[PDB]
Amino acid sequence: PVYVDIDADSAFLKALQRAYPMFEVEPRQVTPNDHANARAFSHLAIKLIEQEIDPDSTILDIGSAPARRMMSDRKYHCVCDPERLANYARKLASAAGKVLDRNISGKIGDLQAVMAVPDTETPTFCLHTDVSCRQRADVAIYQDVYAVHAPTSLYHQAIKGVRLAYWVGFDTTPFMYNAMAGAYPSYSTNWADEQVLKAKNIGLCSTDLTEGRRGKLSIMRGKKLEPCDRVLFSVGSTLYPESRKLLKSWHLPSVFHLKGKLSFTCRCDTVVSCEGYVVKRITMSPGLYGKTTGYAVTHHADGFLMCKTTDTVDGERVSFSVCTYVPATICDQMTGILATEVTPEDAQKLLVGLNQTNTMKNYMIPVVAQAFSKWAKECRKDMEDEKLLGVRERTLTCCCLWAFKKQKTHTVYKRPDTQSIQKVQAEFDSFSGLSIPLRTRIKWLL
Amino acid sequence: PVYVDIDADSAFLKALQRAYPMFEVEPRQVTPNDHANARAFSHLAIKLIEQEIDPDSTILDIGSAPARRMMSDRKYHCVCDPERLANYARKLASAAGKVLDRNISGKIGDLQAVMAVPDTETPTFCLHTDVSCRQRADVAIYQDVYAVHAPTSLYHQAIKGVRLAYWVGFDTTPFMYNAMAGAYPSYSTNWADEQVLKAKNIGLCSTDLTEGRRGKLSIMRGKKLEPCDRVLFSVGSTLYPESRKLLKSWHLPSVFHLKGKLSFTCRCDTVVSCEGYVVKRITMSPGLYGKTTGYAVTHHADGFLMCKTTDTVDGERVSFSVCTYVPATICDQMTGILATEVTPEDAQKLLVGLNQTNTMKNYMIPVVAQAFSKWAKECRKDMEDEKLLGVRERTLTCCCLWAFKKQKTHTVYKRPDTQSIQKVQAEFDSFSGLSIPLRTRIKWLL
Amino acid sequence: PVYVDIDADSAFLKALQRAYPMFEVEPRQVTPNDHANARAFSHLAIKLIEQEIDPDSTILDIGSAPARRMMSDRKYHCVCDPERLANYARKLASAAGKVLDRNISGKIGDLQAVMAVPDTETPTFCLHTDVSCRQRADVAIYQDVYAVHAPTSLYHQAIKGVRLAYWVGFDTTPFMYNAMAGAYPSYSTNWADEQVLKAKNIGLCSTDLTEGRRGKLSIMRGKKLEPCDRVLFSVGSTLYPESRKLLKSWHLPSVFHLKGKLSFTCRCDTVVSCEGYVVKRITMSPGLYGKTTGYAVTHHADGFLMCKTTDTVDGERVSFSVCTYVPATICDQMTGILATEVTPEDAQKLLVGLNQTNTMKNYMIPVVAQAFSKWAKECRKDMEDEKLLGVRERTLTCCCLWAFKKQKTHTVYKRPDTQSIQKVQAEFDSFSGLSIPLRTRIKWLL
Ligand SMILES: Nc1nc2c(ncn2[C@@H]2O[C@H](COP(=O)(O)OP(=O)(O)OP(=O)(O)O)[C@@H](O)[C@H]2O)c(=O)[nH]1
Ligand SMILES: Nc1nc2c(ncn2[C@@H]2O[C@H](COP(=O)(O)OP(=O)(O)OP(=O)(O)O)[C@@H](O)[C@H]2O)c(=O)[nH]1
Ligand SMILES: Nc1nc2c(ncn2[C@@H]2O[C@H](COP(=O)(O)OP(=O)(O)OP(=O)(O)O)[C@@H](O)[C@H]2O)c(=O)[nH]1
Ligand SMILES: [Zn+2]
Ligand SMILES: [Zn+2]
Ligand SMILES: [Zn+2]
């Protein structure tokens, strides 16, 4: 009943079936898409969201195209590109008379009204931003949108009567850990900070061959390579610029409060989670009931690794943090060997032996190996420097100020069935692009 | 007859069938819920409680929502949030005429009456707290509520006529042992003290990568790391703040007395106990019959561990207690190897060998190994420092005061078929949140 | 024909079938009860007692509730609490008309008469103590009651016409041996002296984690750790306070005499004995025929162990006696290796090898191993220090007083098919709790 454009022999099919046990996921490959897993997950997410909400509900579809929202019986108001709008108009024109069970005549009239007056708020389409839109609804969908501030957009939806919001996208946990780069290997996705795009051995990088004869000159002293706001995502071959702050804003706590002219008590729950791709359900309710701990929890069905790795960016040897997702079976099969101190070479050989058909992508096997090795070493150190129960050894420094020694932590390894917990903000109170040729082109197809 | 939203191949299905032999537990997975085991246990607990109590009984449903109690033939008066109330109203409106065997018309009238006047005490719903509620009933249910003071709530229910109360929730034994952190691994649950949330190797923590170059300073001197009242539970990805005193208050003794204007003799018995999740039955009777020993007993079907562990909280190497549950088969299979002194590495290798499908979650295996190792060592010490029968070696210290030497106890290991016994209090005598927009929203659906 | 609430795969089914060969014991598990074995044994004991005594007999049921004694055709005068009384009233009200073959109308009238005048001695119910009761009967049943003085209760029953009494409960032999703690592993039962409740490695204990840095001070000098009267039993999760003297009083000799206003010659025989749970038959006959040796004999179908063990109570390393029951097959399989001196570690490894499904509970395996080891050592000493036949080496000490050397006895091992014999007393001549709210509650259901 639900068909996914993936190969029938894909190992991701089992994971996607586990993530959606309510459907009968059937592989029907029609394209060689290199980010087919992400598309299949997003399609299944949209099907699940539609199944969850009432049929009589109007759905704000933030940051999307109506072309993919026309073959449905739900009232999708698509508020968010020119190519996608042209495709939506073309699909309207090519199905104007073939089927009439999707309000295609009404959608065509709505599009004509919008292209007539761009400020029109027709029930099925809008050209304003999620902030500038004023079409009241009760359900909001955020499918693969990351360049919007989460509390601001959620508040602007809530004041329009939206009580339920859905966010589909990659897990925000790697950016709350503040990794320099990282991978969602199951979805062929690699993201990197703009500063490390010239690296060598990460997922999303390109470097040139050099002999290292001349030491490159720079007008500025770096002396610090820590993550900056700009990041680049590559889902298959699709490139997307993102902001770290806008990504982290979507790492919402379990409870938060939007205070303004109207106040809302909102709850964020991750309802779907498959190998780095999450569907979060946000329930908004007017009022300021309860209290907020400002804590966001990410459960880990699969292992999550943030490891220090040494690469060469533009030929310069540097060290930075790299995140990755390790399959739960690989993490479980490494439990015994991580009891002792294992070298990265032995860890990598063991991972390759356990990966034999590959359970996990091999390009992350080396760094993961390093991570595991470091983790094991660190654990041994923790077992070799056992302290006393309920005491600390902070020393006085010439004043009333007390200081302790921080240990070398080169690996954060969240094993399967663990939970990462982050201190985030839970109280928020700080909340015309149409052109003549595009209008002419749209009208020519209507 | 009883269907649980868990995978048909779940190893927890056998344990849940064992915990509820009276029902035919059938796995019917419909959601990918990451805390599905806890939900299934709670659903089976509610089914068993309903089966136990008389059909003609009024049930006080404390700290819950009626959005999960309408599809029953039993008079559930729900006293305890905004989204859950909205879901209750939605479910009443969507099934107002479809089914008329659940007093849905009466429930809708009661909800409208409560909306008209928030102090109304309709037989099926109330908006007050359990203290503020005054609807007389004979049965109380405490499903997954831990933020209430147990003797106070029980007294306020008893003076309302409640003779039978049921408490469904995680076992309170770990908090009677004063563990800093702990796991209910079977339910994908990890709880941690707020102080150790920045740890590295516990179930519920998040730490950053550091080089240990700058020693972090602090305004105040810690010098002590003992559990504080504030703890955080993560059931799957669901985050709940809890108070240690409120959690311990529900570790009631077998017999206790509530003394006040009316006096009650209450008995607390654990009627269901599956791998860290307990259903407790409290029978309250007016009068002060008998005497109270002030002892609470927990039977351990599976192994219970509280072990000293060394981790890094915010990079500072510290030691604190961590609790966990070990499957009884794992504990029995470790009996022979614990006869000698085993290193944590060998213990972890043996545990991994015994875990081969995993009997226990692997993320608990390392610390468990440490615990077992320490336990073995301690036992050997006890066998190497054999004292004389019925004598003690307390020495005199310059006065009439006698002192003895305490031994290093780094592991409390309650084996399967053992009982932990705690001295608790057994004599107790020290016993308007509605908003206009919520009222309008609820009334819009009625 | 007799159904027991235990698992069909329970290994206790075979033992219970052997203990009751006259019944067809069928496992019908309906509850996950952690002390299901003890309940099944007690139910079979009551069935056998009923099958033994004549149908025309009135049965005094001492220290019990009628909520378990109405579904029978035998006249049960229940003399003994509030919750059980309410349960009995509820069961009477819920079966008043459905079944009329159990004299339920008469039972209801009797309960109403007792609630009218609390001194009434209705044939089927009483509110007085077993001493204050005056309803004549010929059969008395003491099911799981240990807080009454055995000769006093037996005499007060005998002067009321009781010629036959039945006592069902845990074997009193461990308390005649004066063990500090002990286990009935087959019934998931662990008992401990109040002083050793803060132990670490016994069945019923709880201790905390300590670094053993500060030596705890005490106002009093212990200098002795001997059993005190107060003990605590844990049957599964059910906690019972008990008196050592009251428990020992039920370790009656095979023949004893109750002398007073009326004199009786009584005989105590253990008619059922399963792995620590016994049913004793006491036959009372007026007159003082015969003579009493003052000896109580316990036959051991399975091994009984009282061994010195070293634990830490509240961190203090102490040694005290621990008792346990070892399966006869384990004891027989241990005969060969006990011919030599075996270490506790080797003994524990061998016991684990023999326990492979576990024949015995694993948490008793270590101490038992120690026991066995010590026993073997002691036996070797007895063989290495062979004396002369019919001579003793008592030495004179500056007086007419002779002294011998007592040997180290750290293990009492009563093997299967042996008998312990204790010197006990055999000549005994030293022999209003109702509340208004309870009366109103009972009357409301009648
Ligand atoms: N990081 C990031 N990923 C995105 C973003 N938008 C979409 N994606 C993901 O990247 C994939 C590529 O997007 P598209 O080229 O539009 O593919 P599509 O969404 O299936 O639609 P088509 O173009 O018709 O195939 C999508 O499947 C999304 O899962 C974005 O803004 N940021
Ligand atoms: N520690 C703790 N656990 C809780 C608390 N409330 C509920 N839980 C458990 O955590 C799980 C998550 O709660 P919910 O998100 O409400 O799930 P639910 O109770 O099954 O109801 P739904 O949201 O409809 O799924 C529940 O299954 C409970 O077993 C709480 O207050 N404290
Ligand atoms: N040591 C000791 N054990 C007891 C005593 N009374 C009962 N027991 C045992 O402990 C078990 C627990 O008692 P209960 O909770 O009343 O269980 P029950 O007798 O089967 O009756 P229910 O409560 O209906 O299950 C019983 O099965 C008895 O075998 C007692 O006074 N002292
Ligand atoms: Zn719009
Ligand atoms: Zn109410
Ligand atoms: Zn009587």
What one-character-per-residue DSSP string does C345-394 give? Answer: HHHHHHHHHHH---SS-GGGHHHHHHHHHHHHHHHHHHHHS---TT----
Whether chain A has a CB inside 8 Å of the CB on C209: the answer is yes
Residues within 8 A of B (CB atoms), C 146-185 only = 185
The number of beta carbons lying within 10 Å of the beta carbon of residue C389 is 5
* DSSP strand pairing (B58-62 vs B139-143): parallel
HEC profile of A79-94: ECCHHHHHHHHHHHHH
Nearest chain B residue to A255 by CA distance is B239
Euclidean distance between CA atoms C435 and C430, whole angstroms: 32
Residue B125 parent element (H or E): none
Fill in the amino acid letter for C431.
F
Fill in the amino acid letter for B247.
L
Residues within 8 A of C (CB atoms), B 36-95 only = none
Residue C301 parent element (H or E): none
Ligand nearest, relative to CA of residue A60 = 4
- Alpha carbon B239 to its chain's center: 14
Report yes or no: C256 and C292 within 8 Å, Cβ to Cβ: yes
* DSSP strand pairing (B316-326 vs C395-396): unpaired
Euclidean distance between CA atoms B377 and B335, whole angstroms: 14
Euclidean distance between CA atoms A399 and A126, whole angstroms: 62
A410 catalytically annotated: no
Euclidean distance between CA atoms B59 and B77, whole angstroms: 6
Euclidean distance between CA atoms B63 and A269, whole angstroms: 20
Burial of A339: CB neighbours in 10 Å, binned 0-12, 13-18, 19+: buried
Q: What angle do CA C279, C282, C288 make, to 5 degrees?
A: 160
SS3 content of chain C, % helix, strand, coil (to 5): 30, 30, 45
Q: Is A35 in the pocket of ligand 1 (CB under 6 A)?
A: yes
The number of beta carbons lying within 10 Å of the beta carbon of residue A268 is 23
- Max CA pair span of chain C: 84
Residues linked to residue A27 through DSSP beta bridges, in sequence order: A4
With an 8 Å Cβ cutoff, are A285 and B221 in contact? no
Which residues of C are part of a known binding site? Answer: 77, 121, 126, 133
Whether chain B has a CB inside 8 Å of the CB on A389: the answer is yes
In which order are the strands placed within the sheet that holds C427-428?
C75-79, C58-62, C139-143, C164-170, C277-286, C264-274, C255-258, C427-428
Q: Which is nearest to A372 in space by CA: A401, A405, A402, A346? A: A346
Q: Best residue in C363, C411, C439 to probe B by mutation, most B CBs within 10 Å? A: C363
Q: Return the beta strands (E) in A104-180 as ranges.
A: 139-143, 164-170
Fill in the amino acid letter for A299.
H
Q: Return the beta strands (E) in C90-175 as ranges.
A: 139-143, 164-170
Q: Which residues of B touch C314 (CB under 8 A)?
A: 406
Backbone angles phi, psi at B258, to 5 degrees: -105, 110
Tell me which residue in B239, B320, B321 faces A295 most closely, judged by beta carbons. B239
Both tokens of B280, joined, read 């407790």
Hey, whose CA ends up nearest to atom 8 of ligand 2? B144
DSSP type of residue A381 = H
Residues within 8 A of C (CB atoms), B 312-351 only = 321, 331-332, 335-336, 338-340
Helices and strands per DSSP (H, E), number in chain B:
11, 22
Tell me which residue in B287, B388, B415 faces C438 most closely, judged by beta carbons. B287
DSSP-assigned states of every residue in B347-402:
HHHHHHHHH---SS-GGGHHHHHHHHHHHHHHHHHHHHS---BT---PEE-SSS-E
* DSSP strand pairing (A427-428 vs C189-193): unpaired
Residue B331 in marked binding region:
no
Residues near ligand 4 ion, CB 5 Å cutoff? A 79, 121, 126, 133, 135
* Total length of chain B: 446
Q: How far is B438 from chain A (nearest CA, A)?
A: 6
Q: What angle do CA C356, C357, C359 make, to 5 degrees?
A: 70
Q: What angle do CA B41, B47, B52 make, to 5 degrees?
A: 120
Hey, whose CA ends up nearest to atom 21 of ligand 1? A39
Q: Residue written as tokens 């509390």? A: A151
Whether chain A has a CB inside 8 Å of the CB on B421: the answer is no
DSSP-assigned states of every residue in A28-65:
---S--TTHHHHHHHHHHHHHHHHHS-TT-EEEEET--
Report yes or no: A412 and A374 within 8 Å, Cβ to Cβ: no
Hey, whose CA ends up nearest to atom 22 of ligand 3? C39
Whether chain C has a CB inside 8 Å of the CB on A387: the answer is no
Tell me which residue in B267, B338, B407 faces C312 most closely, judged by beta carbons. B407
Q: How far is A112 from chain B (nearest CA, A)?
A: 33
SS3 content of chain A, % helix, strand, coil (to 5): 30, 25, 45
Resolution for this model in angstroms, one decimal place?
2.5
Q: Which is nearest to B244 in space by CA: B323, B305, B186? A: B323
Report yes or no: C92 and C124 within 8 Å, Cβ to Cβ: no
The number of beta carbons lying within 10 Å of the beta carbon of residue A238 is 13
Whether chain C has a CB inside 8 Å of the CB on A386: the answer is no
Report yes or no: A191 and A166 within 8 Å, Cβ to Cβ: no
A159 CB-near residues (< 8 Å, 6+ apart): A260, A261, A262
